[PDB]
């Protein structure tokens, strides 16, 4: 038996601020780590209504939920039960910038995330502060090892109202609490989607599908 069950629940709390607006979001959900699928129900507990596009937050809301082929070592599942943390810089094409940190632990059949999210320098009339984003496009994150830890780069793109795209570069460092078998360079294909939401995004249901592969 692995400590990572075929079905794992999720509980999380995010505290953060975007362009000075503070907020707290809590989440509950469930997913299938070996299928690479998960669903989360998120609730704005402080700072409602959010004055910025909810989409900039959603990738901060766990690479344990990735379908890993057997010939690629799975850094994330191996990291449990002790867990792992990641930090991420998100640099937007209009020089908006976000930095997030998340600590991921486990108890029983449930992951626990504590997430800190800070963003600023977004133009007040840009698509983030004016809530003109529609969705993230599906993406491909390039995973590589450097300094003995696992890192990932992905070029991201938000579809805008009117058909434009608004671009972002993600740089992530992932660090397990213990030493684990490190993989070779590979890729992770992602698809993240807000399945439903209420008017102001105080309630959001969020889905990701993710799968690792070599080339």
């Amino acid at each position: 038996a692995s400590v990572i069950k075929p079905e794992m629940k999720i509980k999380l709390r995010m505290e953060g601020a975007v362009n000075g607006h503070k907020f707290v979001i809590e989440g509950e959900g469930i997913g299938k780590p070996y299928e690479g699928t998960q669903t989360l129900d998120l609730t704005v507990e402080e700072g409602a209504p959010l004055p910025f596009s909810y989409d900039i937050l959603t990738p901060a809301f766990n690479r344990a939920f990735t379908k890993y082929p057997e010939d690629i070592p799975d850094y994330f599942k191996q990291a449990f039960p002790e867990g792992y943390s990641w930090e991420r810089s998100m640099t937007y094409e209009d020089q908006g910038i976000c930095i997030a940190t998340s600590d991921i632990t486990m108890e029983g059949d449930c992951f626990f995330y504590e997430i800190r999210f800070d963003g600023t320098n977004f133009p007040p009339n840009g698509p983030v502060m004016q809530k003109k984003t529609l969705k993230w496009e599906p993406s491909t994150e390039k995973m590589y090892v450097e300094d003995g830890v696992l890192k990932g780069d992905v070029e991201m793109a938000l579809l805008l109202e009117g058909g434009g795209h608004y671009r972002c570069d993600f740089k992530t460092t992932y660090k397990a609490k213990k030493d684990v078998r490190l993989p070779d360079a590979h890729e992770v294909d992602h698809r993240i989607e807000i399945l439903s939401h209420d008017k102001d995004y105080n309630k959001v249901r969020l889905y990701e599908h993710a799968e690792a592969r070599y080339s």
Partner: nanobody
Amino acid sequence: SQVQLVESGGGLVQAGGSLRLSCAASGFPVGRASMWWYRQAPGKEREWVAAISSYGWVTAYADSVKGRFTISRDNAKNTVYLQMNSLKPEDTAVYYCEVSVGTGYRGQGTQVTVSA
């Protein structure tokens, strides 16, 4: 209000010169908030300069300073360093740091003047 922020290292340097700023915070748990550099010149509005994550694993820079400035952080203290190389007159300003975003906690700043 044991929370305090103190920037050090500013000064008068000539164009093409170097300076190493630092920003020391007290009153917070070590390495559990991101830290952010800003600067503000005479009649100009405040500019974001650089940022570093809680644990120091990731960094970010404004386009105007990328490749010239480097941000780093003590793993055991809330102390951040901004190595400023290849300085330009446009870099003249008061530089300050903030813990996290939107906290209201700000330091007095440190004056950087770059003489053409």
